[model samples]
Target: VEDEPLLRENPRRFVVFPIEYHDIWQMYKKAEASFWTAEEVDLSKDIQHWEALKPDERHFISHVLAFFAASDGIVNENLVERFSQEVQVTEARCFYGFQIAMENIHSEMYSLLIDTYIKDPKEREYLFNAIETMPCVKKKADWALRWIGDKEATYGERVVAFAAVEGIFFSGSFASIFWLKKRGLMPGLTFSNELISRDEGLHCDFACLMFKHLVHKPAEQRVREIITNAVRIEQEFLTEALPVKLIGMNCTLMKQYIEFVADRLMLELGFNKIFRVENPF
Candidate 1:
């Protein structure tokens, strides 16, 4: 246990043992036990699966990979540079370290997938740069970075911003794995996606726990607005990106899935459901 006087005077000091047990700490221990690697997954079938796809299927798959590849790097960078240092608690910092490592792994996972399958260097470069051209992607990334990078924003606001990134944006985008696997495309890539999703599930839970612990009356409205704006961005992205049906997923179902995931996260964050759609995926 921490000394009362010393804790009050030097709260930012880091320590390991004699720490107060909290959910975040327990989550951190859990993460330590859940270690995994992308190299462990065999992409042999994935390579063959990639070659056997129709042009339309490959096009859809490329866009999905492009989104993950770009966003994973952004998430990892934001966590390391913007969020990690702000965490004062030693245990929380440990967990953030794991989360940051997971993000790096995710980024590399996409690179492995791309290098193994997508032969054209030019198309691979395009996938990396694809986020620049998407209006909705720009809006979402800028929104997260603004709040997260804001020096003046309170800790609660920043935590909610983290939730918006991990819980809503990343979770919503990950729905494609379900559709991809259901369509019998990219078997190994889908396995890697599942592992990534599991890691992010914990990340979202940790973020929600932090928000629940720190948020108060003054920050409630701002937190709500952050989630609201994030949801709006996803909705608009779906409207623009899925105007026409893709190979295995249609515009309506994909939009519904996005809203559906957002609604679940909103419930976890103590907001009433904003989108009342069933989980189609």
Candidate 2:
């Protein structure tokens, strides 16, 4: 009995916390499948033939439209496809489906513009192929996946990619394109923007819901750490992916557009700022 006094200091027990689970399947019952069905869009002659216009129109419509189209296609393949399986909520699934569909529609929109204006299929083909093979996207995806698999990042980090894709990437894209359309040159393109932006608002809602789910955990928890790491990875990925050699867009402006997006998205997540107020684009 006397020897037992030296044996033990204290006994510890594992602590478990309650977690709220989101039901993707149940949410699907409330989701409307026909929301995107009514958005049938065909470009008008002015909107479709951006390059056929005068020199003033050429600067805004033709150059900006080409950049916008290429950007949309890249965002879809790189960001949308990369995060396909991480969603466990019904709303997440619905948003993903709608976003992908919109991106698909966007690709067609780009193709229509190309067909109407580019004239040479071979030239357009080269441009499209070059955009697809852009090295930035593949590299960023790899970095993001590795972070998603990490256990050290916090919840904020985990949602970084999602937020960036939703708020920053898509917003910057629409901003550039919509800015052109706002000048009244590309009315048909504006119609497409209106439809896409409407859907994007909902996508942002779902993204916020998912973000809320992430941050509900304690600071030191695995979920929080995972998300923290994710944020870092996503920003790095986008920085690497910015198009430096694009004709109309300079790398400085391109990177600024991206960073501005990153900063806004991160702030929305309750994280510190990532970039200063520099409008390179």
Candidate 3:
């Protein structure tokens, strides 16, 4: 009975009690309690805000939404295709199932924002197609799915990969949106995004803990590379997605925000800090 490891190479088919990852239950409950739908948002107000935004601000917002719509779907697929199947622990598996649902909810939120803000069919189609049409968006997606289902990478490496994606990369996007909200724009969309960010925050905390438990203690080099690589990808994205400066946000500040987030994540994983930037957001 005590012979089985928390994550087994050949795991038992049936799940029994005394769950090794007891914290997963807390996460599962928190995720369920945080349940929300896009319909609950009042985008009717945002319709006017959209028109009031300057051309550059509107472009920035649309591109960010486009990237988010694609990235959320990819994250959902990546988890279902690999992480859920590979994580043999029953408790963690339960959370993975719920996290998939949470990701779907976030995807729906983006789609709703699109429909409400951009009424033209071709424009809506364009946002969805940005993953292919937009190079920067595709680059972030490539970084996110890097180790998702790779055959050669160890599960521990895969764990760190996902932690960087969720924690550092996703946090950068949230910072930009929150900055917009802080400066009084897109209140309705940001309200829904606020909820999604909370769920992703929980996801980062969960994945970082998983990394600590699964990965080797001296895997410092791999950790540094993974975190900095994500930061680089995020910086490139900020430059492309935000080609023009918004009222209070720009590429440089957003890039610094990602570095700050990357450093914070490294410290949480028990690694020395890599980036030494103040919180730009």
Candidate 4:
């Protein structure tokens, strides 16, 4: 197992447990413990709160929801199609396999939200089409293709892409969701966001752990370029989501929060601080 690379030309089959990656095993356990459904999350208050919010606040929530409804499905597809098939480790194999279900759960969760908040089937469908229609959203999704959609991506490239998607992209939305929750808006919905964010943070942790062993210094420089660029892209996405700066979150602070999240991801992947921004949350 120790001799194995995360990406093998031929993937190894799983057998009896003599695990090489205990962290991933633990993550699998944590993932199972974190199991939840949209039924468990009460969105009643969020439905009520939906009426009082100004147009922009409503737009913020709906926009994030629009991106999320489509995005988790993409993440699940990547897990099933890319990472789960190529990854040889049983620990990550177990974790991501379960994560596939969790991603579906998040997908279901957002649909539940849109059904609760958005009426007309056409309106619901329109919101669901944000991935295709929203230029910035599509642009961000396209950037994930740098590694995720590759036909012959190396293990290092795959892991870096995973780290980037899980690290920077997902965090971009949750930052806004958490910001909403902080102000006592949409408590129920943001609680679900909280749940989803924790699992994604777990995903980032797994990829970052994988990143340490899978990639090299030359690749490290590439990671620096990749994550930095991703941070910038995510910053624009954040601005697009929250164009009107609320009292607490402004453009600079949101950008700082994003780069700070990137810095944390970088450190987890064995890199130094590029952005010395403080925690906004």
Candidate 5:
């Protein structure tokens, strides 16, 4: 069947499937199948674990959750309010909707954990508010904002900016939380985060694919610069962001994990490896 003329002109008008059913649509289906809600995870055991945690451990975990909470809101805003409108592809916009939904679910997951374990309402509010006080968080968010906020920026640049979010920021944050799960702490919250990571892994891969497809063949250098700068800023973020100390987790392991994943992301984005190290996680 011939493609619709209006769709050929403006694919973003409204999604009409069976139009393009390749990788993007496959991604949409996978996201659909992976649907989950925070209510499914029982937080009873997590509350017990939280009670046993040391003061510093609790403080640091609260900080991490706050960071993710803020990041999720930012991602949802960028996708729904910006990138969803920018893309002129129907399948891609559908996938963006999936992403926006996932971000909402993520924010809910963090909130659920906060409500279930944190106990104090004031403390919960602080976790959400801490996003504003962290310099590294502001640095990373501001950097991405410049590219994604620019109305005239190239599609490739916007895609690159998003790559920083999923590929770098989200991935690194999940790894840190995964470390806690690895060490047998906060099992319920960790399970929810693991679910979120599964969704984010796909988001990061597709963001890389979108960059590759939208950018010209010879524009790899442009992509490299973005990833390179992103990783550098992420490292700086970690410097101040990592907890002074936590049992079975440290700044060193967390930094290594970020670089390890950053290296893989660079390779995925068609750039050279930025870090040479074993998987520290």
Candidate 6:
């Protein structure tokens, strides 16, 4: 009597989330218009079409917004790294274009979320600035590039960036959603976070596979040394810069989590070892 399909409950994702281009215009218009509030307001009059969401939904929105901004910054830099002559592939270029489009969608999602929840100008400025200007990535990437003058250095540096960023830095933010969702905080937001995390995990895996392939063949010993150094320096910079302490995240535990992640990634990418003891965020 019960011969139904097991996957029958799975619904098709047909309609895309609305992008928030005009909301930015609305934000600018209301920046100094004097009607927004810092205190929590009724959710009934606002975002009614969207499902019921709690204050933790706003927290999820901010955290994911910050994470998405950081993710895009790293991947974009990683793409720029691919422009190195060592890339030498038309397919890699095509895949990177698709990656870039997904990142743009991530930004679109965060913008829409922010437009819905955060209304105070000062809060908006802080959130927007922190998201956009997560300078640790730019500083580390640029600093690492200065030491590389040739293809070996470039390829090795790109691998190092992947290990430090895709492996260590971004992964924990995804893991933190479990911490939030386990508390029954924000299921709608959790759905979005899980989707982004899946894509990021794929990106990290691709980078690791690519790095492992390159590391084993024809790379210079000196370049490997540079990768070790760059990863360490980048790790240090992240430790000092991330707002882990301010946000009530346990820095020691977080660092341990990062160390494990870095260690796992290094092994996967065929790097010799992870020498980091302390981690940043």
lDDT of 2 by residue, 134-172 (tens): 344444334444445656654344455545444554554
lDDT of 5 by residue, 60-134 (tens): 677667777677777888887677876667777888888898889888888888777777777778776765666
Residue pairs in steric clash, candidate 6? 239-280
TM values, all candidates: 0.87, 0.57, 0.91, 0.91, 0.88, 0.59
Q: Weakest 10 consecutive residues, lDDT, candidate 6?
A: 1-10
Over 89-167, each residue of candidate 1 has an lDDT whose tens digit, in order, gives: 6777788899888788888898888888889988988777776865545666677668656887766677677677776
Comparing 1 and 6 on TM-score, the stronger one: 1
Candidate scoring better on lDDT of 4 and 6: 4
Of candidate 3, the 10-residue stretch with the lowest lDDT total is 1-10
Instruction: Supply candidate 6's per-residue lDDT for 252.
Output: 58
Q: Between 4 and 6, whose TM-score is larger?
A: 4
At residue 87, candidate 4 shows an lDDT of: 76
List per-prediction Cα lDDT, in the order shown.
0.71, 0.49, 0.77, 0.77, 0.73, 0.49
- Each candidate's root-mean-square deviation in Å? 3.4, 10.6, 2.6, 2.4, 3.6, 15.1
> In model 3, what is the error at residue 126, expressed in angstroms?
1.3
Predict model 4's lDDT versus the native: 0.77
Error of 2 at 175 (Å): 2.6
207-278 per-residue lDDT for model 3 (tens digits): 776666663433789879878888887777777655526645667877888888888888777778897889
